[PDB]
Amino acid sequence: KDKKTRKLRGHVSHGHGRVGKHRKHPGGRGKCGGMAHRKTLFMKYHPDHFGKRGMNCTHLKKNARYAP
Amino acid sequence: MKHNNTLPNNHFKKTAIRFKTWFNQPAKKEKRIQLRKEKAEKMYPMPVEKLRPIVR
Amino acid sequence: MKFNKEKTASRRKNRKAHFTANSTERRIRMSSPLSKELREKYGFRSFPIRRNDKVVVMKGRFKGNTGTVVEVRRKMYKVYVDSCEASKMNGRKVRVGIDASNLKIIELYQGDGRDKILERKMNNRRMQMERAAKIKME
Amino acid sequence: LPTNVVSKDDVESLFFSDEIQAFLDVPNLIKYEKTSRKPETIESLNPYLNLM
Amino acid sequence: KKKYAPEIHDPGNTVKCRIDNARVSFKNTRETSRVLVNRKLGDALNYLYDVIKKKQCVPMKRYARGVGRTAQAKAFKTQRGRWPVKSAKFFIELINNLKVNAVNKNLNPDEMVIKNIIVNKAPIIPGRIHRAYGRINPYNSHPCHIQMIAVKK
Amino acid sequence: VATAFASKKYVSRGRKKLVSRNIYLEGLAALYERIAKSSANEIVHKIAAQLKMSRNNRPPMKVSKLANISEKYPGKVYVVVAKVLDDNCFLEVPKMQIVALQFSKSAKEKIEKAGGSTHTLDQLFEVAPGLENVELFRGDLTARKAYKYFGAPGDRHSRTYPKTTSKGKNREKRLL
RNA sequence: UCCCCAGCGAACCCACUGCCAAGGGAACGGGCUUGGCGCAGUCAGCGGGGAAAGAAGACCCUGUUGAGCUUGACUCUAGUGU
RNA sequence: GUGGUAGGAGGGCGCGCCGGCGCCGCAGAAGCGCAUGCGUGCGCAUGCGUGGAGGCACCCGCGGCGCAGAUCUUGGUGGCAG
RNA sequence: GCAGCCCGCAGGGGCGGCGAAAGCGUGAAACCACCGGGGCGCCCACUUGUGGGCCCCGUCUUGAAACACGGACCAAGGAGUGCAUGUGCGCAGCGAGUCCGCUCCGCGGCGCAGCGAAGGCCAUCGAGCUGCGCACAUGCGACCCGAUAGGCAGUGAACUACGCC
RNA sequence: AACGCCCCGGACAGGGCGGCCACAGAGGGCGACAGCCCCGUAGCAGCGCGCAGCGGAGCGAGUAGCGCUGCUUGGUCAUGCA
RNA sequence: CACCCCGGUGGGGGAUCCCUCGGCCUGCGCGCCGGGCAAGGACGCGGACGCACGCGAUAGACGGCACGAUCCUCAGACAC
Ligand SMILES: [Mg+2]
Ligand SMILES: [Mg+2]
Ligand SMILES: [Mg+2]
Ligand SMILES: [Mg+2]
Ligand SMILES: [Mg+2]
Ligand SMILES: [Mg+2]
Ligand SMILES: [Mg+2]
Ligand SMILES: [Mg+2]
Ligand SMILES: [Mg+2]
Ligand SMILES: [Mg+2]
Ligand SMILES: [Mg+2]
Ligand SMILES: [Mg+2]
Ligand SMILES: [Mg+2]
Ligand SMILES: [Mg+2]
Ligand SMILES: [Mg+2]
Ligand SMILES: [Mg+2]
Ligand SMILES: [Mg+2]
Ligand SMILES: [Mg+2]
Ligand SMILES: [Mg+2]
Ligand SMILES: [Mg+2]
Ligand SMILES: [Mg+2]
Ligand SMILES: [Mg+2]
Ligand SMILES: [Mg+2]
Ligand SMILES: [Mg+2]
Ligand SMILES: [Mg+2]
Ligand SMILES: [Mg+2]
Ligand SMILES: [Mg+2]
Ligand SMILES: [Mg+2]
Ligand SMILES: [Mg+2]
Ligand SMILES: [Mg+2]
Ligand SMILES: [Mg+2]
Ligand SMILES: [Mg+2]
Ligand SMILES: [Mg+2]
Ligand SMILES: [Mg+2]
Ligand SMILES: [Mg+2]
Ligand SMILES: [Mg+2]
Ligand SMILES: [Mg+2]
Ligand SMILES: [Mg+2]
């Protein structure tokens, strides 16, 4: 099938609403605001994103630890 | 960002990122075959490879 | 097909080579076929047309006329044959420019060393036919 | 070489094989009259209103 | 040859004349055209001589906003009239050209009546005027293409 | 909207039409649609609906899963409307007659080396003439890698895995 | 000067524009509703109206947009001194 | 069974070019103008005129693929205004 | 592809001339001249001039005919794309495997099983891999156009400021 | 290498008929669309001349490293650099 | 009468379509400046020569070699 743009020719506000809009970056760029305004996105879908777990191994070697 | 997805690790923030396209890839292959043939013709009896050991 | 990668089949480069041909190449591009009576003697298919060449017109308005070549003009690629003319308003008769591909040479001029140039193409054609005869023999 | 999901050719013709044809229940082929909604025709289908 | 605007029904009995890119005011020469149609060929001369002598005027009807009134425009049931001497002079040379074309065709120029006049806009000849505050505005002439056709009665 | 039966069950239509333009698969789907329109048998109605299903809605069967089935329903014709795959955990399988869409080449060899026979879904009414001793099976629909990540991993008692591309130690784990 | 003429000859501006009264309406209509009128569409005056034209309000507020500037702001820093 | 903004979905119309496949054209192609017809509609087909060398249909594939607006851009032209 | 004849000081005009034609291809629209026809701007109805219905579109807005903003007209141009990585769905090949395209030849990746920070534990167990397509998320100029700013590197005292000769 | 006749037309490269060449039917020109009119296209061609002698365990400092500092790096009680 | 609308003819303008010795992209090849005066510039150089392009007081083809009959606006040049 074709892309969605080929059906949105003719309609103002291509698919993004008149009152809303397609603005540049509302909410911020990337995954910022994970503790402020996208906290609901991180409490729901990535609750283990923030913080530290466990003992760091500086340069884990894959071939030495290979044991399938 | 909006939905449930893996967190994005896309590293195109630097405007200095280059791209190495591979349009020379079929052409380099025919150049590479031609040089190997010309090496074999330069050393006609001698093998084109060295004798190399078997190592673990 | 053309299997030589180093020559163009490009239309743009072939058209630019035709209109910006130099004068040595423009002489070759203004070749004209010989008669069958000339081709039994010389052997080659065509030869570059020259002044004082006898010519029969093969296409166009003057088709079937015979006359001598009185003017060749390499820029605009036009051969002007005697007795292929049109008058101006003031009665002045102008020779009409015919392309060399529309002319067939009846009698080749041989004066200004042209008999050497005809024999050089004739002998190289004869020599190259001998090599291709030996190669197909072997 | 690729394996097809069917063995025979023209598998819709398998419908007329007697192995399938014996298996079938009898379909309803009764062609009904087109219904009418106008009150004179549907009184005329059951003309027993005037009997009382 | 260049075609004329109106239809010629009897080319034996009609004459035509032309001037292209005539350096006249188009709006002035449109208005004097509309008062020259359906006139006898010699009567159109005597009218245009009176325009130059300012005895009769040219009624300005379409291109007329701001034109001052005159008593001579009462003849044409208007008030706005003018005396476009240059367009009157261009038409005199054309009507004189109609008379010589009539005698070249052996028709009586006293019998010809001007049937059609088409005054077309010519391309604009550009010019500049210097203005206040360092601005440059166009100062263009608006020439005209004129066609006349006269038929005998 | 669904069809009822004498056994008070419903078999829904599924897709109105299959999206696959496999001409032979839609020949199979149109065939069983024609049988199901003139039959009260629910197995034909379930096969007709499952033939139009997507690849994700037709999860595959191993021969080890059909082997454990064959102890539960011995001597029957096992019908799967999926691809039957092989288990290299199991060197040989019981003898069983399996009617499926596709068989992998390894699965087809173990069934035949057991003495059993593989058949396609158009051969069903020759293998079982009155459609007798036919046992129709589905694979596990939720045994798919996408079902680990459905839902939200940060809900109250959710066992949803977090969406991550990493397999390292610094990947997101489930907080249970 | 204007005004009238010969010749020359722009720009601003321009959704579209018969004119009123009241009403309704985004609460001050040229268009709607209901009434009152006027219409040969020309010349000159004129500044009531077009909430006239100028100019993405300079006032005010908002912006997680600034800049100039100040200091008891925060973090630094040339300089002086040890 | 039939309203519909924001919005989502489906099926088509249209454009440049592609791989094919049916064809057409100096006895006049595209384009254009005016007509007639078809079409719910996007649009399509024909006639006549012009034009003077290419083009059409369908199936496929690629996409810088459809405009009334952006104080849009560029060009042209009006009214204003003799 | 001309200047013959008549007219004009001339530019030129008219009868002509060359050529298949065009006469520096085609020649749309805005717009204009003249001529011809007709007078709702649109929709409906019919016996065509009457009646009935219609405020200016776009837009933001709770609400626009608005005394809200943009729009004189017309042509042409003109705005969700590309890549990367995901996810979901559909399709496709094979399937405990799968992936040609780095290369002259992947035991490289993912999957066949997970848990824990780790020591350690290890199943009662599970279809995937790859491609194609769309939607969507993110990074990128990121639908198009738009700041005031900030920086880096340069150029100017012909205006003007001051000082010197 | 290999093309003639007829029709239409201002002109044949068009149409019709009949051939021909092809290791050449890529492309361009020629008064319309040319394998055979032209330019082209496919196709076809190699070799020679040189190389000699006399030490071989020589070894690396304002460095490495450490301390401090500044920069840098994925480099983490320091990766690099100063 | 003006005004408006529709058509015809003529204007007006340059859209459309067709064309394209141009661009763009990719691949390959080359990869060679300079006191032996470079890059760049200035000024000059044609019978009639402004621009462009060419050129350097040997100044709009000087020599060698190859080519072989035209160049052209006029005048002329040309198998020496
Ligand atoms: Mg919007
Ligand atoms: Mg949307
Ligand atoms: Mg809001
Ligand atoms: Mg906070
Ligand atoms: Mg006045
Ligand atoms: Mg000034
Ligand atoms: Mg005046
Ligand atoms: Mg009022
Ligand atoms: Mg009223
Ligand atoms: Mg007034
Ligand atoms: Mg006022
Ligand atoms: Mg503002
Ligand atoms: Mg805020
Ligand atoms: Mg609806
Ligand atoms: Mg909508
Ligand atoms: Mg087309
Ligand atoms: Mg079409
Ligand atoms: Mg676009
Ligand atoms: Mg537009
Ligand atoms: Mg719009
Ligand atoms: Mg104007
Ligand atoms: Mg033209
Ligand atoms: Mg709203
Ligand atoms: Mg409001
Ligand atoms: Mg509105
Ligand atoms: Mg108001
Ligand atoms: Mg405005
Ligand atoms: Mg457009
Ligand atoms: Mg995006
Ligand atoms: Mg900007
Ligand atoms: Mg800053
Ligand atoms: Mg600076
Ligand atoms: Mg040191
Ligand atoms: Mg009109
Ligand atoms: Mg242009
Ligand atoms: Mg390049
Ligand atoms: Mg020098
Ligand atoms: Mg010389």
Nearest residue in chain D measured CA to CA from F28: D11
Give the CA B44 to C1' I102 distance in Å: 29
- What does each C-alpha distance from F76 to C11, F51, F69, F136, F171 come to in angstroms? 73, 21, 10, 10, 48
Q: State the method.
A: cryo-EM
Distance A23 CA to ligand 31 centre (A): 24
The set of chains that have 3 or more CB pairs under 8 A with A is B, F
> Contact F101/D5, CB-based, under 8 Å?
yes
Chain F contact for B10 (CB, 8 A cutoff): no
Between B and F, how many CB-CB pairs are < 8 A? 9
The b/e string for F20-32 (b: 16+ C-beta within 10 A; e otherwise) is eeeebbbbbbbbb
> Contact B6/F165, CB-based, under 8 Å?
yes
Return the SS3 of B31: helix
User: Six-digit token pair at F110?
Assistant: 């173990």
Q: What is the largest CA-CA distance in chain A?
A: 61
Asked if residue C24 keeps its beta carbon closer than 7 A to nucleic acid strand J, the reply is no
Asked if residue E49 keeps its beta carbon closer than 7 A to nucleic acid strand G, the reply is no
C121 touches C45 (CB < 8 A): no
Q: Which residues of A touch B4 (CB under 8 A)?
A: 44-45
Judging contact as 3 or more Cβ pairs under 8 Å, the answer for C and E is no
Measured distance CA(F84)–CA(F118) in Å, rounded: 10
Asked if residue E15 keeps its beta carbon closer than 7 A to nucleic acid strand K, the reply is no
Expressed in Å, this structure's resolution amounts to 2.9
Measured distance CA(F10)–CA(F6) in Å, rounded: 10
Angle at the Cα of E69 from the Cα atoms of E65 and E72, rounded to 5 degrees: 125
Report which of E117, E115, E112, E95 is spatially closest to residue E152, judged by C-alpha positions: E112
Nearest Cβ partner of A47 from F169, F170, F175? F175
User: Six-digit token pair at F99?
Assistant: 């009617």
DSSP structure string for C49-89: --TT-EEEE-SSTTTT-EEEEEEEETTTTEEEEEEEEEE-T
CA C89 to chain centre: 32
Protein residues with C-beta less than 5 angstroms from the ion ligand 1: A 13
Asked if residue C62 keeps its beta carbon closer than 7 A to nucleic acid strand J, the reply is yes
Return the SS3 of A43: helix
| CB-based contacts of C107, cutoff 8 Å, min separation 6 | C38, C53, C54
Beta bridge partners of F80: F137
